[PDB]
């Protein structure tokens, strides 16, 4: 842990970016696989921060690890591999908390490994595991976005003013595919500090030819009156109908409801978790607190904030939105309500 | 010591040619408002107490426009002084004449009459004086640069420069343009003497604002073939030191050519030069008041907007301009006393005062100056400039980059 945490957020880990976990490790990593080591280093340094990008990188690293995995004698691999992959996941979590996508993916991989019988050969098992990972990715990530792109194309109209927030690999694709089909609309990109990841969507839209706008989230109440729809992306859909997404989503949906604007949500079926949550206090993630430091004017005001023992710096990442503010959810199965997540989980 | 500046209200370079024949460069209406007004407002806002306005080309119009302006009033704190002369041929001659007259005393700023900026120079000026007071008579000039992207529309190749300065203490060691050249050369003296902290910078926008010193005019009198500022810096770097000051939270740019003109206009209308905006009316004029509304749409008095027309983006309508029915204007600047027809599409068009556009005209990315006129069924292409008092017959389609002027040799005559 680094720095002093908040009283209400003292049950969560607060790591740092400068403090690397590879200091107390061998350059040729013995206990940990080099692939997983570099993956955790990238996660800690922020090289891979996308919800789906993180899962894809994790699965590719796991494929690489399996490619060079030798089953010892005196034991089967169907269990040795599961027992060996656990410390890797623990190290990855120590580097950066895992996401719901990564959790579901490792669960599916463990289930598939357990489904392998000792009756089969090692090479056949490894090849089947690799092919299974490949086709699972292609289905739940690649093919799971083409159906959502043609389902949301119906709800997009000419002259619409769609409002997006943050960065999402699915929202940008939906908009870029709807623009090329014949729709002529304009997008409003909302961003928040300190990540400022909305600029990614802004650039991806400008390069596509869609008229786009950019403004910070505090001014969301000023532009919403002219907004017709609010298309948002999330990281996970809880079993209680709620939605887990970036911290600046719940208040955005609240202001949209206050302005009488229909809110939408687009998520893949593989992000349908089984747990539940009521607020952003029981399970969240506190990133490095020094990200709030900003060069405003002539000097920084939080340059030595740790000298003040009473001052705390909260850097929440995720948040939980109630089902009372979500109208429609878009998936590969079709348009379903916000209170139908358990039905899809069935 | 009161801060004093020198304003060169004449660019002996002729890039707006043919347009600079009937009317000076520095009085071309950018946003219903002259450029010298922007420059004078910047100088008056940064702390300048006295200015010396030098004009050679069409100086009578410049002065007789300034004498009605608000900076020449007895209630202005920046007293301006117009010095007109027919001998001036380049900036070097102007500095030579200042040295001959002994007008300047202390650190003075050297800016052109077509510079639009909201930069504050108190910080840079302090740095300059402190630096000169640690090394007596060492630092001679401080050039202000605005860090930008090499992709930005405002960065034209004609003004694009590359610098190699020291990072320990901001100091110019090499300066050269990049107009029509692909691989840059940097001599070895830079690493020969000093500059352990040396770095090449290509992300800079030359604001043409420089805090000069009397020694600058002295050296300009010594070397007779210094015709501009760029050559002063090159000839001083072959041999005194020249330093910089970089800004990141302020705007500054010089209108050097036509492509540069349409770049500052979008920024000024889009409030990139705050507080300097059309809504502010920084001239104290009666015929330039407007009201800013959503989407940066500015409407003046007596706009006479017709039913059906749609203003979609950052447009600026003048006072007295008349708009018809079922029109479509966007990213377009309309002057005062303009009068449009019906079914008129304007996309990134700059219409000055006294223009009339007939019905059925489609104009895109082209500039119409004073007293211009186009008949019905006329379509103008991008960069299709019309100068003063031309009339385009009906059913004509002008090619891209076409230039029409009433002077025979200027361009394709009327």
């Amino acid at each position: 842990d680094y720095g002093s945490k908040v009283s209400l957020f003292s049950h969560l880990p607060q790591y740092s970016r400068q403090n690397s976990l590879t200091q107390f490790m061998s350059i040729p990593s013995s206990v940990i696989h080099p692939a997983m080591v570099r993956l955790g280093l990238q996660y800690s340094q922020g090289l891979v921060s996308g919800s789906n990008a993180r899962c894809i990188a994790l699965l590719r690293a796991l494929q690489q690890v399996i490619q060079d995995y030798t089953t010892p004698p005196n034991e089967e691999l169907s269990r040795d591999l599961v027992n060996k992959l656990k410390p890797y996941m623990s190290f990855l979590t120590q580097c950066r908390p895992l996401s719901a996508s990564m959790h579901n993916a490792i669960k599916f991989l463990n289930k598939e490994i357990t489904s392998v019988g000792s009756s089969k050969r090692e090479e056949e098992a490894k090849s089947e595991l690799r092919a299974a990972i490949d086709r699972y990715v292609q289905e739940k990530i690649v093919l799971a976005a083409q159906a959502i792109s043609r389902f949301a194309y119906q709800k997009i109209s000419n002259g619409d003013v769609i409002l997006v927030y943050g960065c999402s690999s699915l929202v940008s694709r939906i908009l870029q595919e709807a623009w090329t089909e014949g729709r002529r609309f304009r997008v409003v990109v909302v961003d928040s500090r300190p990540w400022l990841e909305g600029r990614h969507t802004l650039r991806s839209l400008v390069h596509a030819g869609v008229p786009a706008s950019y403004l910070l989230i505090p001014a969301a109440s000023y532009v919403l009156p002219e907004v017709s729809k609010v298309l948002l992306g999330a990281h996970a859909l809880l079993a209680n109908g709620s939605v887990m997404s970036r911290v600046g989503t719940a208040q955005l949906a609240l202001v949209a409801r206050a302005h009488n604007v229909p809110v939408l949500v687009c998520c893949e079926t593989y992000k349908f978790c089984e747990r539940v949550q009521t607020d952003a206090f029981v399970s969240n993630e506190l990133d490095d607190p020094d990200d709030l430091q900003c060069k405003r004017g002539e000097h920084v005001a939080l340059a030595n904030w740790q000298n003040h023992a009473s001052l705390r710096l909260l850097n929440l990442v995720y948040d939980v939105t109630p089902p009372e503010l979500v109208d429609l959810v878009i998936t590969e199965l079709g348009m379903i309500p916000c209170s139908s997540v358990p039905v899809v989980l069935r | 010591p009161p801060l004093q500046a020198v304003l060169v209200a004449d660019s002996f370079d002729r890039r707006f040619f043919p347009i600079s024949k009937d009317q000076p460069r520095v009085l071309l209406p950018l946003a219903n408002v002259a450029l010298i007004d922007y420059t004078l407002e910047f100088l008056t806002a940064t702390g300048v107490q006295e200015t010396f306005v030098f004009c050679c080309w069409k100086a009578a119009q410049i002065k007789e426009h300034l004498l009605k302006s608000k900076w020449c009033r007895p209630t202005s704190l920046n007293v301006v002084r117009i010095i007109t002369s027919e001998l001036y041929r380049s900036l070097g001659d102007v500095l030579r004449d200042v040295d001959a007259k002994a007008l300047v005393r202390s650190d003075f700023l050297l800016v052109y009459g077509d510079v639009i900026s909201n930069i504050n120079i108190t910080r840079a000026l302090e740095e300059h004086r402190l630096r000169r007071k640690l090394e007596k008579n060492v630092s001679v000039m401080t050039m202000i640069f605005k860090e930008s992207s090499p992709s930005h529309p405002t960065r034209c190749h004609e003004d694009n420069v590359v610098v190699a300065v020291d990072s320990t203490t901001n100091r110019v060691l090499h300066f050269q343009k990049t107009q029509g050249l692909r691989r840059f050369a940097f001599p070895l003296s830079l690493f020969q003497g000093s500059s352990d902290g040396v770095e090449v910078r290509y992300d800079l926008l030359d604001c043409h604002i420089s805090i000069c010193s009397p020694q600058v005019a002295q050296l300009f009198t010594d070397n007779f073939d210094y015709q501009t500022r760029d050559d002063f810096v090159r000839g001083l770097l072959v041999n005194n030191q020249i330093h910089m000051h970089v800004t990141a939270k302020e705007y500054g740019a010089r209108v050097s050519n036509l492509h540069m003109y349409s770049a500052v206009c979008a920024d000024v209308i889009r409030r990139w030069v705050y507080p300097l905006t059309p809504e502010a009316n920084f001239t104290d004029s009666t015929t330039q008041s407007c009201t800013h509304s959503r989407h940066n749409i500015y409407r003046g008095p007596e706009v006479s907007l017709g039913h059906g027309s749609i203003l979609e983006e950052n447009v600026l309508l003048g006072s007295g301009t008349v708009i018809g029915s079922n029109c479509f204007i966007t990213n377009s600047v309309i002057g005062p006393g303009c009068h449009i027809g019906d079914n008129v599409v304007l996309d990134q068009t700059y219409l000055w005062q006294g223009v009339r556009v007939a019905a059925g005209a489609q104009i895109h990315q082209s500039l119409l100056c004073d007293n211009a006129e186009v008949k019905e069924r006329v379509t103008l292409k991008p960069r299709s400039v019309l100068t003063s008092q031309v009339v385009v017959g009906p059913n004509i389609t002008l090619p891209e980059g076409s230039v029409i002027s009433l002077h025979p040799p200027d361009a394709e005559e009327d």
Binding site: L333, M335, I336, P337, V343, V344 | -
Partner: protein, 266 residues
């Protein structure tokens, strides 16, 4: 086309037969007369054109889904099973009406009429308030048919639904089509009554059959297709203003219809 002829035949022969039931009957009758799927889609569009209601479209979609030797058997069984949907809904909904309660009903509907006819048969007493439904004077027909059963009906004004909302213990209205999110497509004067009922915590009940489930998800009054509205004739009511649903499949919540539709896959 003889399709419209048979449709009008079934509609005129049986006055209380629903539109969707008659459409499905005509479709099954013409099925006796691959290639077949397009033939059917064509029949469904002409029928849909003659009567622009959501019930007919829902019934046609459900029939075609049933179509994807054995089809005649399954269709006869389906028709006989859907015939008793009215009684199945009545036997389940008439128990929610207690003595001394005031009812607030919308324009005429055969299902609510059957529910009330079954409730009064169980030795019960209540009061009813029917809206005139200005678009077409069918609320007066409902009040007449109710007073014919010896019940103290009272016709109210179309703009007085908010004035008598405090004097109503519950609200029971029909539905032309149940959308995927639990909402309902009902008469144009239904969205305003549900809003008042919610503003005064009044149980807003909805009565509909199973053949009225449609794969639609309107976000507001604009997302509704214009072919159903045509002074619009119908409106969409959000599920947050509905308390429960009485269907032949049993008493359902606003969310169970989405589960049923997902199970059916359109």
């Amino acid at each position: 086309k003889e399709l419209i002829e048979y449709f009008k035949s079934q509609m005129k022969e049986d006055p209380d037969m629903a539109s969707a039931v008659a459409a499905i009957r005509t479709l099954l009758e013409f099925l006796k007369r691959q290639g077949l799927r397009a033939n059917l889609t064509s029949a469904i569009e002409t029928l849909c054109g003659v009567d622009s209601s959501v019930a007919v479209s829902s019934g046609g979609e459900l029939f075609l889904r049933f179509i994807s030797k054995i089809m005649i058997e399954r269709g006869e069984l389906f028709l006989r099973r859907i015939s008793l949907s009215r009684n199945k809904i009545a036997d389940l909904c008439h128990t929610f009406i207690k003595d001394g309660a005031t009812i607030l009903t919308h324009a005429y509907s055969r299902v609510v009429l059957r529910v009330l006819e079954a409730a009064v048969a169980a030795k019960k007493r209540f009061s009813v308030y029917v809206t005139e439904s200005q678009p077409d004077l069918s609320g007066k027909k409902m009040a007449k048919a109710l007073c014919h059963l010896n019940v103290p009906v009272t016709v109210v004004l179309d703009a007085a639904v908010g004035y008598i909302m405090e004097k109503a213990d519950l609200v029971i209205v029909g539905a032309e089509g149940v959308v995927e999110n639990g909402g309902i497509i009902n008469k144009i004067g239904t969205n305003q009554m549900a809003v008042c009922a919610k503003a005064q915590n009044k149980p807003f009940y909805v009565v509909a059959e199973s053949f009225k489930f449609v794969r639609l998800f309107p976000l507001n009054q604009q997302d509704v297709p214009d072919k159903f509205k045509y002074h619009p004739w119908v409106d969409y009511t959000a599920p947050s203003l509905i308390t429960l649903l009485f269907t032949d499949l049993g008493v359902l919540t606003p969310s169970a219809v989405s589960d049923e539709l997902i199970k059916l896959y359109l």
